[PDB]
């Protein structure tokens, strides 16, 4: 077990931020034997990794690591190999009508929360966030949602768990299996698209994009869909949990001593769900006084870097009026988030709608999902008001 950072340790999973802070103070560039990687905890070094594809690659084949099936995709290539898919997706995404989306979501949140106000109590994660973000992402892409039976939550759990495979090698094969399942769902979608949305635009925009219609585009569409579903749900659960656990904070939003603009951004900085982004070093480099060798992996701990006191005054405090707030919640560079505008609409719509129920309060203990790469809750018991 690691002297400084065990990300699947339950005591760390309950609250990783003190471990982050201590790690940043003592070894800001730290060699983690178990993850077989360097860990960067500082805002300046994570931004430097994220901005330099020539020196830090997502294509681990460049350091002789074969890419498993279902995983070669937009996320796991660098420019210029990645730029056609990146541009196809950027175009497909900008061709969408975000006001239509926002308005349909606002109707949906208001109806969902009047339904949940009728109950004694409910779980915000499974009864609101997951329902809401699944509607959001299937409307945005233009597909019919999958059925949310227990097999769906089972593939979702395996896929999330698979991100931590370096620490649990038995998690790999179920993640590939789970990702293949959702590829079978993506192929169906692409094989009979509807008339509007991101996915229809991709099919339409293929001719002369430079992108072939193969499993690489399929893996890319699966990852677009799965991130579009899960990451906002992780965020919504973390955000509401932090507001209720932080004295005075919800009261500040209710009274209107702060806008959703600075508040949503500060919530992303403080408890954003993405904790780690790994890259392969293609050329010897010095970071933090440590010599990173060609062939080694480095990991930007952006969740830790977003609480770096070198960048943020009073980094451990939820300051809903924070300005400036140059957080890395949505990444930087060739692989920055394509859904950040959809992410922020969901957060403003969800929060706007909860502010209709000022008496909202916890109704039990939150439960943290056992994931280190992508952090979120599996329940947030609540009663509305």
């Amino acid at each position: 077990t690691d002297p400084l950072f065990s990300p699947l340790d339950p005591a760390v999973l309950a609250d990783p931020y003190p471990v982050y802070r201590r790690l940043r103070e003592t070894h800001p560039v730290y060699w983690h034997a178990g993850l077989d990687s360097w860990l960067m905890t500082r805002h300046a070094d994570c931004t430097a990794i994220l901005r330099d594809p020539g020196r830090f690659s997502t294509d681990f084949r460049k350091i002789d690591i074969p890419t498993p099936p279902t995983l070669l995709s937009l996320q796991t290539l660098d420019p210029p190999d990645q730029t056609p898919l990146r541009h196809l997706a950027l175009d497909a995404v900008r061709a969408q009508d975000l006001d239509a989306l926002r308005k349909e979501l606002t109707l949906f949140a208001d109806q969902l929360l009047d339904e949940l106000a009728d109950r004694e109590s409910f779980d915000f994660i499974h009864d609101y966030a997951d329902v809401f973000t699944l509607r959001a992402i299937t409307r945005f892409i233009g597909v019919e949602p999958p059925e949310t039976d227990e097999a769906f939550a089972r593939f979702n759990d395996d896929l999330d768990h698979s991100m931590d495979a370096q620490l649990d090698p038995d998690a790999e094969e179920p993640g590939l299996r789970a990702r293949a399942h959702f590829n079978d769902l993506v192929r169906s979608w692409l094989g009979d698209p509807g008339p509007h949305g991101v996915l229809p635009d991709v099919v339409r925009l293929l001719p002369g994009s430079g992108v072939e219609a193969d499993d690489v585009l399929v893996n890319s569409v699966r990852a677009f869909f799965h991130a579009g579903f899960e990451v906002p749900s992780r965020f919504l659960g973390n955000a509401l949990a932090a507001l209720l656990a932080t004295p005075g904070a919800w009261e500040q939003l209710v009274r209107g001593d702060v806008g959703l603009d600075t508040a949503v951004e500060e919530l992303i900085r403080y408890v954003g769900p993405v904790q780690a982004l790994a890259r392969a070093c293609l050329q010897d480099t010095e970071l933090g006084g440590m010599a990173v060798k060609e062939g080694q992996v480095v990991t930007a701990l952006i969740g830790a870097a977003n609480r770096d006191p070198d960048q943020f005054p009073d980094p451990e405090t939820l300051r809903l009026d924070r300005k400036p707030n140059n957080h890395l919640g949505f990444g930087r560079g060739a692989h920055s988030c394509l859904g950040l505008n959809v992410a922020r609409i969901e957060a403003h719509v969800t929060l706007g709608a909860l502010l209709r129920h000022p008496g909202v309060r916890s109704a039990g203990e939150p439960v943290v999902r056992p994931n280190g790469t992508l952090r979120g809750l599996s329940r947030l018991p609540l009663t509305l008001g």
Binding site: P7, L35, S37, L71, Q75, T76, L159, S162, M163, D164, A165, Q166, L167, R179, R222, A223, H226, A227, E230, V274, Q275, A276, L277, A278, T299, G372, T373, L374
Partner: peptide
């Protein structure tokens, strides 16, 4: 830890 969907 690879953030890969």
């Amino acid at each position: 830890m690879r953030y890969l969907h």
